[PDB]
């Protein structure tokens, strides 16, 4: 599974630019695609979402109208066309793979991101930095403005880890379920208030931990909890 | 030729068979023990079930 | 000589019959004549799963009691969300003549097979989003009638070559073979997974030890082909449906037939048998377009499922016992409570 | 009502439904045939010379051909036991059963008649027509002309048999071979018309090893079968 | 224009009473069997159910007409019930005509061309053409509600949907009814059949018995349609080209209304011809 991205750089304000994403190694047609931005020092922010079959397209309130999303399934390439660029649109953009069926793991694979520099349920992470040492157990907590437990019995909270100079990697989806390829050390639990517990910590778990809601669009992230040695 | 059949019959003959009364008692015991956990035999309160 | 061997076999069969007859201390019907009847079970359809092009032969409930796999002769398995009727997966099959399907206990794999004599295991949870053929198991010289998963790596199959086989998955080779003088039609695995009973087209059902590989016990009594077979949840009993329009419940420990379920108003063979969670209810699909729910202890027809315009081919009860799903030749599955 | 992931799952189900409808458009327009016969019968030759013109233990062999822009799937059975009572149930919805019989073998002609009787009177094929391919007509012609073996030694009703008036003898072929082949066809058609009412019909055809018209006769017979099915379904009879 | 209506009191009540009594139960069993065909993947079920619904609408409208002809042709039910019932008695028959034409075309496609046009014989196509046909009602019904048709005669009776000395908005819609509604449907029926009758009598699989039976059924259907509708449309023409004075209205009144009453037997013949004679119906009966 590989999600390479391209089409970013220096652009003068008020211009336009198209971002492309080449997917190779998985069935692109059956996967929904997401564009998620991250400012150079701030956290993650969802930009757009296109569904399988291109029948459900959602945009963030800050990009709606002036951004459009599209896909080419035969060419296996995602596109985000952006017009009327502003200073707020200086970020690394990430392509995110997310399938939706019973038991599926959305936001399973993230791309590599492209830098573009120009010249609503609230997720609160009250803790931004945590001093940690290897071998200990730490718990990262998030809060939600609205209850994420739906009537179907699913609490739609997602956990991501952004290691230094790397794309976010899914850890826990739906607040309890472990992703594929993450060690059993990670565990998550919660209710409006949540937590992510890491036991027997290793040196590869340092980074910024983000919590994301998926109960209703727009998908809103948290500030992020940085774990430094 | 038929030696395999004879050996199979001999191996299947010397077994320990309990009385059919004890078999019926065991089946009844299982049914009565798990009766309360059978939604089809004992209907659900129509709110715990996932199809209504 | 041959005559001596035949005489010895006849003597051994007579000895087995006498030993079985010398244990009929009290018939199960006589003992359960005192227990109360379950009454009329007015089961009702709640979800109709439609989308199959042709008739369905096999269905299997997941361990989660929410995901179904249904095999139809349109070359398709469909993995249904029972709760929401949503179609989770649609797996095309390279052989359209499918007679069996199995859903792995872990939920990671599905199985299919039919007149192509191959047990195809499909991987559901892959890094790519598509369902891929994990592998194809070949070695049977007859049509594959039933397949069941011991785990993600072992699968037991029954074929029309008068043979069952336990297969390893990582190495697609018959770990062991089980040798019935007729087409084997149905398999059922004991809850302990260490044994399995198989019914064949010789009115005989054989209980096999999976590890050792030899026929532990054999049971007779039917007058025609055995088409379906299942275990009582205890693991020490099993029920068989047959083309002689009768169901029969046997016990391994008693090593003899316990009880028979039949009515003069039904003259069609049983095509799919299943037990409720308690074992009090024995559900049997028939060619009369119905699924009859019997009281397994009283031989009293306690309910009828009548929603299919064609013959009921497959039938299965969830792990939690909430619902019973029956799929028929009318291209539909129906979920009942 | 529905969560976002639930709506996306519903969308996935809708796309699966769309693909299933596209596949139904193909399944409805594709006709499935069941090829039956014996080792003596040249059904393998028919398969070869019909696939040309248009795994070790594998029990099914699918030959897909096309006539007048309509698709057909013959399904030969080649790795199954002599018993047929059960897997035949899988073919209760096929358009036709193509039954190939070696007319030359007088010794095994009764076995062929018994097998055809089993197929015709089967419970699950009560609404399924049989296209009867009396193969190896050239061998039968040679055998009857160079007369050493006689049908009267196998069927003691050939002496008191006359060629039916509604006969279509091929040009330049003797009345003896016509009498023989029509006697064989009449045995098969007598079994066919002894029962079955009008739900299914047996279509007889005198075929040879190298005939190129077999696909055409299958197409015509299947067209007639579908016509009868539509007459029944659309309330015309 | 002093026109007398004694046929409306002698033969009309009988006809309406009979058509009601023998058609309301008939076009309910017919509807049930059409629904049964709908349960199976049968395209003809949509057409049968729609035809039965149109007939049921005609039957529903019948009691008002019976009451009307009972009181010496005096529609004492307001100026809108008259329009509705007159539409259901005059313009509603063409919905049934279009639906039996749909049945005939579907039969021709299924019999004469079994290997093609599989798209056109789906439930989606059937409901699409049914929606198109019902649009026409809506869209003709509107046209008729545009005009106000209640005329008080010499005896103060309010005749409904009938102005004898025919009007200028008539004499042209009657041409439309004849050309599109009789001539085109009868041509469509005589082309769909005799194409079915050519596909049959060409097949080598059905016996001569059944082949003659199918021809008899087709001939009965076509002849019943003709006997029900041809006199009415011929008289519609005869009244749209030679009617200019009150004298001709008195002359042709009896014939025209006899033909109109003859059209009322279509709703009682349709369940017989399209649902009762079928062998599938006999099994579930």
Tab-separated table of N, CA, C and O in Angstrom, chain B residues 8-9 11-15, chain C residues 178 194-196 206-219 252:
chain	number	residue	atom	x	y	z
B	8	UNK	N	-12.498	-52.394	10.951
B	8	UNK	CA	-13.262	-51.203	11.307
B	8	UNK	C	-14.451	-51.556	12.188
B	8	UNK	O	-14.735	-50.860	13.171
B	9	UNK	N	-15.156	-52.639	11.856
B	9	UNK	CA	-16.289	-53.059	12.674
B	9	UNK	C	-15.837	-53.474	14.068
B	9	UNK	O	-16.513	-53.178	15.060
B	11	UNK	N	-13.167	-52.334	15.661
B	11	UNK	CA	-12.776	-51.125	16.377
B	11	UNK	C	-13.986	-50.310	16.809
B	11	UNK	O	-13.951	-49.660	17.861
B	12	UNK	N	-15.053	-50.319	16.017
B	12	UNK	CA	-16.265	-49.584	16.350
B	12	UNK	C	-17.222	-50.378	17.228
B	12	UNK	O	-18.228	-49.823	17.680
B	13	UNK	N	-16.939	-51.657	17.478
B	13	UNK	CA	-17.827	-52.475	18.296
B	13	UNK	C	-17.517	-52.325	19.782
B	13	UNK	O	-18.424	-52.146	20.602
B	14	UNK	N	-16.238	-52.391	20.146
B	14	UNK	CA	-15.825	-52.369	21.549
B	14	UNK	C	-15.757	-50.922	22.032
B	14	UNK	O	-14.691	-50.315	22.156
B	15	UNK	N	-16.931	-50.365	22.316
B	15	UNK	CA	-17.031	-49.025	22.882
B	15	UNK	C	-17.932	-49.077	24.107
B	15	UNK	O	-18.658	-50.055	24.316
C	178	UNK	N	-10.698	-39.200	5.337
C	178	UNK	CA	-11.701	-39.959	6.075
C	178	UNK	C	-12.536	-40.722	5.058
C	178	UNK	O	-13.223	-40.116	4.228
C	194	UNK	N	-12.700	-31.331	18.149
C	194	UNK	CA	-11.909	-32.551	18.064
C	194	UNK	C	-12.610	-33.678	17.317
C	194	UNK	O	-11.961	-34.676	16.990
C	195	UNK	N	-13.904	-33.550	17.041
C	195	UNK	CA	-14.658	-34.566	16.325
C	195	UNK	C	-15.510	-33.891	15.265
C	195	UNK	O	-15.769	-32.688	15.325
C	196	UNK	N	-15.950	-34.679	14.287
C	196	UNK	CA	-16.954	-34.173	13.360
C	196	UNK	C	-17.778	-35.327	12.814
C	196	UNK	O	-17.263	-36.420	12.584
C	206	UNK	N	-21.518	-40.862	10.141
C	206	UNK	CA	-20.308	-41.342	10.791
C	206	UNK	C	-19.669	-40.230	11.608
C	206	UNK	O	-19.494	-39.111	11.115
C	207	UNK	N	-19.328	-40.543	12.856
C	207	UNK	CA	-18.601	-39.639	13.736
C	207	UNK	C	-17.123	-39.989	13.664
C	207	UNK	O	-16.739	-41.136	13.943
C	208	UNK	N	-16.310	-38.995	13.305
C	208	UNK	CA	-14.896	-39.137	13.010
C	208	UNK	C	-14.073	-38.377	14.035
C	208	UNK	O	-14.442	-37.267	14.445
C	209	UNK	N	-12.942	-38.969	14.414
C	209	UNK	CA	-11.946	-38.294	15.233
C	209	UNK	C	-11.021	-37.533	14.294
C	209	UNK	O	-10.390	-38.130	13.417
C	210	UNK	N	-10.942	-36.217	14.481
C	210	UNK	CA	-10.200	-35.374	13.552
C	210	UNK	C	-8.708	-35.659	13.634
C	210	UNK	O	-8.031	-35.787	12.608
C	211	UNK	N	-8.169	-35.764	14.849
C	211	UNK	CA	-6.729	-35.939	15.006
C	211	UNK	C	-6.281	-37.316	14.531
C	211	UNK	O	-5.316	-37.436	13.769
C	212	UNK	N	-6.970	-38.369	14.973
C	212	UNK	CA	-6.533	-39.724	14.648
C	212	UNK	C	-6.815	-40.064	13.191
C	212	UNK	O	-5.963	-40.632	12.500
C	213	UNK	N	-8.004	-39.728	12.706
C	213	UNK	CA	-8.342	-39.922	11.315
C	213	UNK	C	-9.143	-41.158	10.979
C	213	UNK	O	-9.287	-41.467	9.791
C	214	UNK	N	-9.668	-41.874	11.967
C	214	UNK	CA	-10.447	-43.074	11.707
C	214	UNK	C	-11.884	-42.881	12.171
C	214	UNK	O	-12.169	-42.056	13.043
C	215	UNK	N	-12.786	-43.651	11.568
C	215	UNK	CA	-14.208	-43.579	11.886
C	215	UNK	C	-14.447	-44.079	13.301
C	215	UNK	O	-14.324	-45.278	13.573
C	216	UNK	N	-14.788	-43.166	14.205
C	216	UNK	CA	-15.029	-43.567	15.584
C	216	UNK	C	-16.333	-44.341	15.710
C	216	UNK	O	-16.374	-45.404	16.337
C	217	UNK	N	-17.408	-43.832	15.113
C	217	UNK	CA	-18.693	-44.508	15.234
C	217	UNK	C	-19.487	-44.336	13.952
C	217	UNK	O	-19.255	-43.410	13.174
C	218	UNK	N	-20.446	-45.235	13.748
C	218	UNK	CA	-21.362	-45.160	12.620
C	218	UNK	C	-22.788	-45.345	13.113
C	218	UNK	O	-23.032	-46.073	14.079
C	219	UNK	N	-23.727	-44.672	12.453
C	219	UNK	CA	-25.128	-44.695	12.839
C	219	UNK	C	-25.976	-44.888	11.597
C	219	UNK	O	-25.769	-44.208	10.587
C	252	UNK	N	-23.953	-39.968	20.371
C	252	UNK	CA	-22.701	-40.700	20.230
C	252	UNK	C	-22.475	-41.639	21.406
C	252	UNK	O	-22.045	-42.782	21.219
